[PDB]
Amino acid sequence: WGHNGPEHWHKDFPIAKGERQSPVDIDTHTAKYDPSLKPLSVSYDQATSLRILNTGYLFQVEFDDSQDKAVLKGGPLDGTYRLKQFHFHWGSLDGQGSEHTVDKKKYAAELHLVHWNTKYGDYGKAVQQPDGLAVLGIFLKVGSAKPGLQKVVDVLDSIKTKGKSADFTNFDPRGLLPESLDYWTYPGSLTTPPLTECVTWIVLKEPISVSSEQVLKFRKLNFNGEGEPEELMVDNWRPAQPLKNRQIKASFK
Ligand SMILES: NS(=O)(=O)c1c(F)c(F)c(SCCO)c(F)c1NC1CCCCCCC1
Ligand SMILES: [Zn+2]
């Protein structure tokens, strides 16, 4: 999988045609304000980043999730979700790259901060539960630079190819958040195989702005390993999937 794009994944993972697949188009006019959504709590003051890795499909920054350092709580969530890693999906052009869309609009990229429900003890147990993960999704549009992103961009040359990693300590993910925490939420899935339906998605309404030069540097990563023909790492997003009977709730309006 990666002739092997998202339209093929159902043959190995039949849940690809399931009832709670992600991403989805967020129709802002049909999302329902839910005044009962409890306040969202993003507590990242003790986050401990470890490493950055080129997985062959995207890059990710991993955290020490062996204690409750950085956690997500509140909003639609019951209980405590620990930050495990963040990663991005992005496009070959500035008008595509996000996984979720808003009124059919695609953004240049989307940041996913992935958290697992600590009641399940480990993330591998959490991924087999309907409420195992909470992913905070943040859109990226191209405009002014994002200062809090530059440390990540500057390390990408050291993880150009599949399977490279590098130390990535002391990175503060708070620098990647927009001002507002207004959000939409809905039940969905992972967006790559095995596509399991274990995610409570929380998608922030306010995008962050990143510079043309920052996203250009995402696009110089490679899907291939070292010493293999170069395939630029672009368009690593899954398109919107049918919403089926689901309701998207809004925390605002
Ligand atoms: N959008 S997403 O969160 O489904 C996601 C991808 F689309 C990916 F393409 C990747 S890289 C391929 C899987 O190793 C990914 F790590 C995650 N997240 C991981 C989160 C950590 C543990 C849960 C398992 C899913 C992979
Ligand atoms: Zn993702």
Is the separation of the CB atoms in 172 and 148 below 8 Å?
yes
Flag whether 192 is marked binding.
yes
Q: How far apart are CA 195 and CA 22, in angstroms?
A: 8
* Strand (E) or helix (H) holding 61: strand 59-63
- What count of other Cβ atoms lies within 10 Å of the Cβ of residue 149? 22
The resolution, in Å, is 1.3
Breaks (C-N over 2.5 A) in the chain follow: 2
First to last CA, the chain: 40
Q: 217-237 burial, b if ≥16 CB within 10 A, otherwise e?
A: bbbebbbeeeeeeeeebbebb
- What count of other Cβ atoms lies within 10 Å of the Cβ of residue 163? 11
Q: Residue 84 contacts by C-beta under 8 Å, 6 or more apart in sequence?
A: 62, 63, 65, 114, 115, 116, 123
Closest ligand to the CA of 60: 1
Handedness of CA 226, 229, 230, 236 (dihedral sign): negative
Nearest CA to ligand 1 atom 19: 114
Instruction: Determine the Cα angle at 39 with ends 250 and 63, to 5°.
Output: 100
Q: How far apart are CA 200 and CA 141, in angstroms?
A: 23
Residue 136, strand partner residues: 113, 202
- Mutate which of 51, 59, 112 for ligand 1? The one with the most ligand atoms within 8 Å of its CB, which is 112
Kindly calculate the radius of gyration of the chain based on its CA atoms and give it in whole angstroms: 17
Is the separation of the CB atoms in 91 and 235 below 8 Å?
yes
Q: How far apart are CA 249 and CA 230, in angstroms?
A: 42
Q: How far apart are CA 222 and CA 230, in angstroms?
A: 6
Nearest Cα residue to 129 out of 181, 93, 185, 78 = 78
Question: Measuring from each residue's beta carbon to the nearest atom of ligand 1, which residues come in under 6 Å?
Answer: 55, 57-58, 60, 84-85, 87, 112, 114, 123, 127, 135, 190-192
Nearest CA to ligand 1 atom 24: 127
Q: How far apart are CA 136 and CA 113, in angstroms?
A: 5
Output the six-digit token pair for 35. 């005044």
Q: How far apart are CA 8 and CA 30, in angstroms?
A: 30
Q: 120-139 burial, b if ≥16 CB within 10 A, otherwise e?
A: beebeebbeeebbbbbbbbb
Burial class (CB in 10 A: 0-12, 13-18, 19+), 154: exposed
Nearest Cα residue to 248 out of 5, 20, 1, 3 = 20
Q: How far apart are CA 220 and CA 231, in angstroms?
A: 9
Strands 199-204 and 183-188 come out as: antiparallel
Nearest Cα residue to 107 out of 96, 121, 93, 116 = 96
Nearest Cα residue to 73 out of 40, 113, 112, 117 = 40
Nearest Cα residue to 93 out of 240, 218, 230 = 218
Q: Residue 74 contacts by C-beta under 8 Å, 6 or more apart in sequence?
A: 38, 39, 40, 41
